[PDB]
């Protein structure tokens, strides 16, 4: 068995892996996304399904208003006493010196649901984590926040006890590991092999920095011993390694014996001529960050990645039997599974998929810009060179209503190609983009006339590494490209930074409309050609 | 009869002043603060009483995550058919090349409410405004925003039909005005007066370039001819004068035949050193945009303002006979004093309550002050270059995460606090943090201030002179000590902070934040503010 | 008689207007420029033309290494006892919180007479005037610079006794005038009307917010009065008036008993679409100050300028004939003689044999290789000013290159960091190419250096051409004579402007002109023709 890392592509940061007997399964960061939480399922480790979204409730997660790059941070998913247990932190600052959120943890029978509601448990921190001891007692870590404690310079991991019976934590808090010397300490997870406790811990950033740092301890409460290598899995020093920004691991053992473990990686972009060590010379990540899988062998009571301690594309699987390109016609009554909301559920403010059969009626609401209300059905790029296409129809009537395909990253960071009304001209192809909210509107002074008779209006993207440009038909046959070519590298964390630099690029459609008076475009159908 | 601009002080830009009978009101924008809309009272244009806070519920007004500088901006109150008329708009988006928002109507029987349900007017822009006309037709107008229409190169008036009994508006949209070069038009108002019909625009941007523009025609969809002299009050070419900023004129006719314009206006702190027309130099302004008043004489069929086109202190007053002419809040009664207010959420069980401890306020644990959603912080405007405010404070903290205490604050990203803490290893702590444009400064973090173990209250204090202003303590309430950091006053005001939100200006009030969300709780007896 | 204003076009500031008899004279400031100083003059105010450029030599004036916006400040032209007083500062520090200088004065009986080796004046400050007392007595006038003294907060104005007989500046100072608040001060003259002396003060530095203040007192040594207003000229509170940064006057007496005062100003473009007082929205100006002239009237023993304090395009001439004058703007260069053509300034150095020749190949401008256009030490760039919106320069280049740190050609330059170049070089591959390279606030732009454009072989000659029209210009070539092609890019004229660099050196203005490289030093060098300059 060989396994080509990443095992998920595309925006999915932060696994937690767990399982259930002969099921593996993995949790991913949604952050603004919705609904929240991503849950993959496998029985070889190779290759790997959609099989949850628990947090699709506003009763369960709300994220109206919240700003760019927050929202669902690292959840934790654990398997204990025949029921799932799930974690997740609800970001609400994320441009401040400190942040502040809420710590959840809801249950489920199966993977599938129903999923009880919320119980609080804190907002001292993020990076949750459950730890089920094996005399039944449960211990929660976190990495607490607020001033002087975001590596200025404090960065610690504390641990408080947990009653299931009742529900309550413990008031008192167990320091267990201060810092290494990289810092931005995270990401706490706590296992007993052997003899000893193993916490595994994540250390220099989600950057090019990221490190996987373990140490080991004999009592729950410390003092913890650090690993002979201090780092157990790093790529910061491999500028040329395919597989980048490796960290974040979430250790397992199967069910064969063996020793597992899904970490964070991305692939980056290298524009020519810029050296390769100077600022934004190791790469672009357009796609985000995506999850890996690596294997755990065991010397002297210490983990070691087997093959060293970068990120391989080419892993070895377990020892079981191995198990056995998208389109939306929105021909059904629910929405496909892989596109998704920004903040808000889907319902009829938005759209409706039975208002006119075979198509998706989206409502006008407010632009892209916006963190309140955007009518926006958006899915996540998944590859270097891909071809998204949709066909709608649409006749507005003012300037202020508009409707077309995006490619999207943030609410500062966006471009758009849409269809809109010129007074004295009729309906117009536009494109307008946001770098580093910085507008860019190419053709509004001589935009691009379209048919009266025309009765839809076709739209494409294509990518193709560095660059996407766009297109548009009126018959289907015959296809015109808009005279603007676009840098795709500018939808990369690499690019924008700053304190939210967390998601990656999408592409979706989306309709708006400033007035409020009210607009709908009907969609028929969505693809996703890649090469 | 005198009056003395500035009439309304602390923060309170954008008055719209109305009438019935004999009695004038004008309302004035909140912003993020709740409740919103403060509506004053008078008989003689001088003296100026708060009569209501309309928008002081959730169903009629939400702004929970609402960025900063967002939330309620310039309203209109008009009283026409019986009854008042309120509307306001509710900015989502500020920090972005265009912006978006709502727009609502409300109205009521009479000042102190019952107000009814708010009816939606529109997303399609700000500064909405409605003209009753003399023949019962009513008029929308507002200036639209989005994509180049934020004076890149764009800045129209536009005009929609609107039917009372129904509660819709026309789909059509009538453009009265393109913008002059001064550009950042905006706050139309229609007035007919003669046989002609006035626009009234305000020009510039609410910087010392505001301009108050006047256009006139015949027939109400235009043409419209400017004024000659174009500008009809600004301040900008003065730049020794008190008063500055003035613009976003609302007009208004007495009984008595005279004609008065409400207008905002600023007093600016000039640092020493600083030439006068460099970057800064004009002045820095901590108390924000004020209300002034001016009158208005008539001379061949235009207005003009009566002494000069720029803002002074001492105007005349109406012919009305003058009407009969320091803070504490005890905490005593059921509700908070009205001049006290919370930042985009109710008064309500979650934030504190005036009922578990009866005569004091307790502050429960929520987000600290660079929170966009759910803090406990109760705050009152900054009304003097130089003060005093003082608070007694009871509260025994546990760990790190839970704090309360004094503030002074402008905008999220831009405030101090003075509180008392929990250090692990000595106990209860006083320190103090700043943030200046986002950048953290705590310099007490490392050598705390020790508070006795067996002192049952601590005083906190601050103490406000012009350009600077400082913090102080006492655990006894005779004897004083001073925290030894000097910070600067000048930087919670407008001309510091810059960007596309400078428009609230500074804030005093008392905090208690939980970050760790155990729970925890702060009484404070009162809350004193004695000018000098 | 009318005078359209401004009276002198182009890069021209600092007025320092004089007269002997009834001759009048402009002396105006020259920064980075070689040689310094450019005198005009006039015999009826309207009309005025180059009579003198006295720095002309390194014994004089040197400038190599000199930082942007450096050089010759404003100069000071004064006529008594029978000879010319000329005061010229060189400034050695722009981009500093202080800066540093020094001071010199020469004379001459003539205007283009020989000038005497200057002698040393010290370096305390800048702005430097002398002003002759009817008494026999001279005092020196300067504006103290170094720490603290640069608007932060004190900017005076000091005065010291001159012995013109040894030539001693008397150790004790005198502070006249502490500065109002627009601050800025600077520009100090005295002068001698009734029984009062005068003192005019330039505020507000020389952006939109320049002003003009006017000081009187009894005796010479204070205290000093301010005007009743403040200011006598000034055009901050009129942002769309045709003149803008009006200041630093200059007051003269005519032998017809009228006064008149010189000052500096700017004609700005502006971008559509943007608010006319927010950033940048009060213009760029690509053609630098320049100067103009006013006219004064007494009314109580207070002067003030006809027609309002903002600058005039028209004012009112004296009571002279107006000598002739001629057609204008069809400037150009064949370079037949000995000597360039006065309107042609090399950059800090003397064109020598060093930079070019015109005897090597008669009627060809023979420029040498040297450093490219960001160095301030030696660059073999001859250049004029820009003088209209909307003009045409034309040249006609031979060159041959043989590697590609060779270069020639045409060239529009404000300074070190901000210029334009269209050249013609030698590429591995191909041969001849055309390029070019932009700098703007210090980043480069190469668009045609991956592609450029093929040069034929047997082309003897190649013409260059730069068309300037308002807010752009651009580049073409031709090989024939007759059929033109362009350069497909096109350049923004408003970033060569001061408004828009910004810094402690924004003084000065665009030029044009020819230029010639080699990075290598191996030796090369680039004939031309001519030079044309034809306005529309
Ligand atoms: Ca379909
Ligand atoms: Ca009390
Ligand atoms: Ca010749």
Redesign the interface.
């Known amino acids: 068995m060989e396994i080509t890392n990443p095992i998920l592509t595309g925006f999915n940061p932060d696994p937690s892996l767990c399982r259930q007997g002969e099921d593996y399964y993995i949790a991913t960061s949604t952050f603004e996304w919705f609904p929240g939480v991503r849950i993959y399922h496998s029985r070889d480790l190779k290759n790997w399904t959609l099989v949850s979204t628990p947090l699709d409730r506003v009763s369960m997660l709300d994220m109206?208003?919240?700003?760019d790059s927050g929202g669902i941070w690292a959840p934790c998913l654990s398997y204990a006493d025949g029921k799932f247990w799930l974690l997740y932190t609800d970001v609400?600052?994320v441009?401040?010196?400190?942040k502040?959120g809420?710590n959840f943890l809801v249950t489920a029978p199966s993977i599938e649901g129903p999923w009880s509601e919320p119980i609080?448990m804190?907002?001292?921190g993020f990076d949750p984590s459950l730890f089920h001891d094996d005399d039944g007692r449960k211990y929660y870590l976190y990495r607490?926040?607020?001033?002087?404690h975001h590596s200025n310079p404090h960065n610690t991991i504390v641990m408080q006890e947990f009653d299931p019976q009742t529900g309550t934590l413990s008031?008192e808090?167990k320091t267990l590991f201060t810092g290494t010397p990289l810092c931005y300490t995270e990401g706490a997870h706590l296992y007993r092999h052997a003899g000893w406790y193993y916490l595994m811990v994540a250390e220099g950033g989600t950057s090019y920095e990221h490190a996987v740092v373990v140490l080991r301890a004999k009592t729950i409460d410390g003092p913890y011993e650090l690993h002979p290598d201090v780092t157990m899995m790093t790529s910061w020093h491999l500028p040329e390694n395919p597989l980048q920004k490796s960290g974040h691991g979430s250790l397992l053992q199967t069910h064969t014996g063996e020793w597992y473990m899904a970490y964070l990686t991305s692939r980056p972009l290298r524009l020519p001529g810029v050296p390769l060590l100077a600022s934004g010379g190791r790469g672009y990540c357009p796609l985000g960050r995506e999850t890996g899988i690596a294997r755990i062998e065991w010397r002297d009571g210490w983990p070691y990645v087997e093959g060293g301690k970068h990120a391989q594309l080419t892993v070895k699987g377990p020892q079981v039997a191995e198990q056995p390109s998208w389109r939306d016609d929105f021909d059904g009554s629910t929405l496909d599974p892989e596109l998704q909301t920004l903040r808000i559920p889907f319902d009829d403010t938005l759209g409706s998929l039975t208002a006119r059969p075979g198509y998706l009626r989206l409502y006008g609401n407010?632009?892209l810009?916006?963190?309140?209300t955007q009518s926006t059905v958006a899915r996540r790029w998944q590859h270097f060179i891909f071809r998204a296409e949709t066909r709608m129809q649409f006749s507005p009537?003012?300037?202020?209503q508009s409707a077309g395909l995006t490619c999207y990253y943030n609410?500062?960071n966006w471009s758009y190609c849409f269809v809109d009304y010129e007074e004295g001209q009729g309906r117009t192809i536009k494109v307008?983009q946001?770098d580093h909210?910085?507008?860019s509107?190419p053709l509004?002074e001589q935009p691009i006339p379209v048919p009266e008779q025309a009765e839809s209006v076709w739209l494409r993207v294509d990518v193709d590494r560095l660059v996407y440009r766009y297109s548009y038909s009126f018959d289907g046959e015959t296809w015109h490209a808009v005279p603007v070519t676009y840098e795709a590298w500018k939808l990369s964390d690499d690019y924008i930074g700053g304190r939210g630099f967390f998601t990656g690029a999408f592409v979706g459609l989306h309709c708006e409309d400033?007035?409020?008076?009210g607009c709908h475009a009907d969609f028929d159908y969505f693809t996703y050609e890649p090469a």
């Open positions: 109206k208003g919240n700003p609400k600052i441009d401040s010196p400190w502040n809420r609080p804190g907002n001292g607490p926040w607020g001033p002087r008031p808090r407010d632009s810009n916006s963190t309140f009537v003012h300037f202020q609410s500062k307008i946001l909210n910085v507008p509107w509004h400033i007035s409020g008076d």
